[PDB]
Amino acid sequence: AMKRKKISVIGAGFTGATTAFLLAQKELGDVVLVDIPQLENPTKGKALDMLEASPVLGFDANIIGTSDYADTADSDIVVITAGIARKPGMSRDDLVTTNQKIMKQVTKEVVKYSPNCYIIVLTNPVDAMTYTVFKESGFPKNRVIGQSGVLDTARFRTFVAEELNISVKDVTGFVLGGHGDDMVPLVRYSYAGGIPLEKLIPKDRLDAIVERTRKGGGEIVNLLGNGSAYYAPAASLVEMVEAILKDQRRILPAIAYLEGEYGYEGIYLGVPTILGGNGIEKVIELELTEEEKAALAKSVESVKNVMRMLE
Amino acid sequence: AMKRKKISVIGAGFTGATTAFLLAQKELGDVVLVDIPQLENPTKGKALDMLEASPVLGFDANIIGTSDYADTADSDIVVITAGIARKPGMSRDDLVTTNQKIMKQVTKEVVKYSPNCYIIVLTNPVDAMTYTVFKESGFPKNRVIGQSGVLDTARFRTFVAEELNISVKDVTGFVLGGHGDDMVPLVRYSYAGGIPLEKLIPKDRLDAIVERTRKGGGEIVNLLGNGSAYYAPAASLVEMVEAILKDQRRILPAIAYLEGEYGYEGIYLGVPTILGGNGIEKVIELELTEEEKAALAKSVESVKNVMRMLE
Amino acid sequence: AMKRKKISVIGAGFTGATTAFLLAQKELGDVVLVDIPQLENPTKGKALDMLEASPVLGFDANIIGTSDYADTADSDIVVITAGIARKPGMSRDDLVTTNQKIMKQVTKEVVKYSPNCYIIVLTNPVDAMTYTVFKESGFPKNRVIGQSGVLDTARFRTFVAEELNISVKDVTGFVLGGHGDDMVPLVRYSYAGGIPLEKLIPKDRLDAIVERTRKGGGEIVNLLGNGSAYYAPAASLVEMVEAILKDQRRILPAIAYLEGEYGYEGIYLGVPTILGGNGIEKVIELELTEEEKAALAKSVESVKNVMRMLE
Amino acid sequence: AMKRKKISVIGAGFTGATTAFLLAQKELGDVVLVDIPQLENPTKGKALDMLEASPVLGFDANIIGTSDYADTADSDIVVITAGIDDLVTTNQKIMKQVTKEVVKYSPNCYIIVLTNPVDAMTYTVFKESGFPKNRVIGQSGVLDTARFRTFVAEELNISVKDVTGFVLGGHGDDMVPLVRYSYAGGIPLEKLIPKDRLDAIVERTRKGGGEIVNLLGNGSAYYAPAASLVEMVEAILKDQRRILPAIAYLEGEYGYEGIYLGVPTILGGNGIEKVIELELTEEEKAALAKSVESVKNVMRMLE
């Protein structure tokens, strides 16, 4: 018998709710939206409101809200958005201690009810939180993935598209490294209809676009005043969920476990990835200049510093 | 030159923001999201977050947030979601009069910059607020429309689909009048696969579905705590916008100005409508039973009552 | 590991190819397009032409053209469009017996390589050809299905839409039995925005729409000069395939095996069905008037009559 | 009032019909399918068939078949697929006859041309129309990049979504691909596929149209060409400002003028908003020079 895919979204706040609604609209599977017992009723309210949209938008989906992880049993994909979010002036690194505990508590319940699932993590700081989920899970590395690069290249592409007055569809970006201020946007691997951006955009304006990408999460935090971005992070999660569920073998930046690639091991890092029905099918190694190699090395040091703060 | 449709959404809260994001993903036009000066930055945050999703979801649309109505100039369609969140223990009169003042202020600036726009109104109470928008615009009646019935039919279809374990695609509801006590459903014009629902669902369970539809807004409030539905309301506005922008000539329940239809004149009422490129193309006049006529007379009496609260 | 659905389409003519292309652009699965050994190369050309559209239209799907049923192994769904048109100087008896022979040979190869698949049959006459697939497969009845009523309701809806100048989305048709004189339309369960059509269209013009639906296949045959309709038949097959692959539990008219429904057994007949992940989830039994029962009894004699033409 | 876009497709053969069905499914506007008086009824049949699918696929569009150009009045876009040395001279006369009726009923329309050889036929459509260069476009590069992307995706076992190609000039020997400006997820293909396999993919791309012809035995490709037309139509109707290869009128770009050539383009609401000029190596300028010579050769066969 033909059975729907099942996606559990852990954390039913801004990012989780926005993710859930996109997953159901795209009919990518049944959705279980999970929060803490104190936010059970709000979570069910969000889930029923989304389901009540299904006849207008013309989609078939089950959406439920729960505080009971038994409702996540046999999920194909579990998306983790559970944790504390930042306010203006905070680094993503300021959340490590609270979020690590949430990741350990969440992973333990997820692997109990869905021992065969793929896990995609948003929770900040995401390199260190995806690492925590990996180790707690006991899963092989292909099955635990972080989102950062899709969102960072998305922001990059938006600003480039505004600069050149072209469709975002024909702009390509390339971000490696941690999801931090030390991100390594590779302008050399960045194009407008395949044309190197360095040939199209003067260095000063291109440098400003690279800096605006680095500070992109902060820009949304400062505008909102009382939370962080959710539309583009949710979109970024859905693209990664869709690559796996439909076995698309996309080349996408994702937070992956390294065992030698770029000359690093035992860390999660933002790298180029093949993403398919088996999760991360492989980490792609670019040939880097010594300047890019150095920029990446600073990124890895930030990651390891954050990992030293884990219990 | 071919130019995009332009949609302004007035009020950048949960419903306005959710509507803007759906409109952009469907590439129905460029979106201008408007709120009060005090929320200029949050509104610009939401709009820029949505645009940053565009390279990932693969849509071409411009989204800006603003507090300057000059940014709304030459909108084809304006959606009004502006209104105050009812104060704990505020009188219905003070609500009507506070929201009436907002519709008057909003409508003045909208018609100044967009003299040819179609306006769709969500603001509660939608009958009296659409009436307020109509009289202040001095637009013809075909161009000033309220949302109500589409949201009630959506909830009705969800509940019927749950009862019968079938797709929402193959359920239809039929509602005249507004929300709650003011709703006039025709179960006799309500079907699963074109089969009367009275032949498929026992009377006690069908009456319970009709009641649950009446109370359906309050059901989401009670689950959320401090808030009201936005996913299904947003979907409802988008279906009505889409019907006009693509000249689809849908049959949809809408809040329309009457001039003799059903016996009534000088009022806005939830009635079946052909909705297309000239907005309300006509009000459809059913033959109603004596019971139905008297349920509608009582609904119209509730509508006259709210109109007497206006200044 | 997540794996794409696999759909084999048997017969790479107008309907089969049109069907394969729609299935691919919807990313419903990988498509295997099968024809006779003599048409191997044109079938590969069609498949590769479709595949070369994938980067432009933006779908991830494999499409291959073959004469080797080994390529159909582990198909979730098989769509049988294989068949021969009535050649000038051929009896109807010979036409039926030729198509029966094709159904026997195709089914034997299909079930050898896909013992767990659902089968959807287009080949006319669909009632007798579906029965042949059913008897040959050894499959339970829920897994062997014919297309007929979806295509008839589609033409009916198109004609009503034109008559009323409204969206086809808001029109519904209801038909039991087959095409032509075998069609049993229930205009009383056919609506525009849930309004019975008998109230909106005078009887003469409405009877003319019913008769044009009966003749609908013939109208396209007579307009083309060579061959029969393929766009609407392909779309009808795609709606039924999607209902099963996505477990939609649609209510759709289907050619279903009866074991007592409507007072008939051991035949395939056009009936309302719930269509989902287990295939036909049930046949829906309506209360019919004496007029409707008499009309459906003539349709049943026509089915039994073609079954008597089978070897 | 809000009113649908109107698209006329001239030639209701395999490519015209396939284009029309895609345009209506995507709700890009009303479709008018046009052919010769002798095929009026088959044309109405295909159009009615496509319309009868609309309730099932859930799209709202009008689709009509005709041999009367009066029905194409006020078309926002007109796609020309009508056609069949002597090849040039016959198809040229089809273009002049078509353009004359098209500009008569739709003087303000954008025109996209498929008819082979599309360089000369787009030139003929341009001169006859008297339209500015921005309103008369040929399809070629999108089709060639689609085949290339398909071959590369197969070679690397990855999504066609993350493969890009870059072709100047026309089909076959006339095709000037820039493998250096072709990538998988932004990675240069020269670092992913060895030269022998990449050369074979470039050669398959050149022969790609011939490969479908040989496999079919009784016509040429229609699915990928129709998709190539729809993407260019969509860039214009929805003012997307896509960068796409297109057959465009040159007034100095790449050092050439008074010809149509396959060049990178910004495609939006005003049709071709600009011809993009990039720095070519000396090998690529030489190849483009050879390609342009071949376009001048076919342009001399025109009456």
Ligand SMILES: Nc1ncnc2c1ncn2[C@@H]1O[C@H](COP(=O)(O)OP(=O)(O)OC[C@H]2O[C@@H](O)[C@H](O)[C@@H]2O)[C@@H](O)[C@H]1O
């Ligand atoms: N142990 C837990 N189990 C389940 N849900 C939890 C748990 N702890 C917290 N949550 C829930 O996680 C949700 C987080 O949502 P928001 O506070 O709205 O934050 P959001 O914007 O979604 O960001 C979530 C996360 O992703 C990053 O972008 C951000 O920095 C943060 O780490 C809240 O609803 C909260 O109750």
Ligand SMILES: Nc1ncnc2c1ncn2[C@@H]1O[C@H](COP(=O)(O)OP(=O)(O)OC[C@H]2O[C@@H](O)[C@H](O)[C@@H]2O)[C@@H](O)[C@H]1O
């Ligand atoms: N004069 C005004 N101009 C513009 N925006 C305004 C104005 N007055 C209020 N607003 C804005 O309207 C928005 C209303 O959003 P929410 O309070 O979040 O309510 P929402 O869920 O969006 O529902 C919109 C409206 O529809 C009805 O359900 C109800 O009447 C509600 O106010 C707020 O962001 C508020 O700042």
Ligand SMILES: Nc1ncnc2c1ncn2[C@@H]1O[C@H](COP(=O)(O)OP(=O)(O)OC[C@H]2O[C@@H](O)[C@H](O)[C@@H]2O)[C@@H](O)[C@H]1O
């Ligand atoms: N044994 C077989 N196995 C596989 N394919 C076969 C076989 N016998 C014939 N076919 C193929 O079936 C295809 C039928 O295509 P068309 O003749 O173009 O007919 P189409 O418009 O697709 O209609 C398909 C069929 O369904 C009904 O409408 C009608 O009964 C018609 O035969 C042809 O390509 C034919 O070679």
Ligand SMILES: Nc1ncnc2c1ncn2[C@@H]1O[C@H](COP(=O)(O)OP(=O)(O)OC[C@H]2O[C@@H](O)[C@H](O)[C@@H]2O)[C@@H](O)[C@H]1O
């Ligand atoms: N003057 C004309 N006006 C309109 N239509 C015409 C005219 N002359 C011919 N046609 C029609 O053009 C159609 C061409 O369709 P096909 O022969 O099937 O060719 P197709 O596969 O659609 O390719 C169309 C064209 O594009 C190029 O690939 C190549 O030049 C080919 O001729 C036919 O229906 C033919 O009757």
Ligand SMILES: O=C([O-])CC(=O)C(=O)O
């Ligand atoms: O910055 C944040 O806090 C959330 C996030 O990860 C992002 O938006 O980049």
